[PDB]
UniProtKB/Swiss-Prot annotation:
<feature type="disulfide bond">
    <location>
        <begin position="36"/>
        <end position="45"/>
    </location>
</feature>
<feature type="domain" description="EGF-like">
    <location>
        <begin position="2"/>
        <end position="46"/>
    </location>
</feature>
<feature type="disulfide bond">
    <location>
        <begin position="6"/>
        <end position="20"/>
    </location>
</feature>
<feature type="disulfide bond">
    <location>
        <begin position="14"/>
        <end position="34"/>
    </location>
</feature>
<protein>
    <recommendedName>
        <fullName>Neuregulin-1</fullName>
    </recommendedName>
</protein>
Length: 63
């Protein structure tokens, strides 16, 4: 059940720099495990989420 890196055809399975791996064991089809970037959600790590206090746009988080 080792985390072997997804082949190029599959590395796109997780986006936004999501480091795609696959649980290498002779049971599952190709069950994925993606070490996604801090502040992403969804199966494919498609939707970004608050990295900062991403709501206080007035606060000096933007600039």
């Amino acid at each position: 059940s080792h985390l072997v890196k997804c082949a190029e055809k599959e590395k796109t399975f997780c986006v936004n720099g999501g480091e795609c791996f696959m649980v290498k064991d002779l049971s599952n089809p190709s069950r994925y495990l993606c070490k996604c970037q801090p502040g992403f959600t969804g199966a494919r790590c498609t939707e970004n989420v608050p990295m900062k206090v991403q709501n206080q746009e007035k606060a000096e988080e933007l600039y």
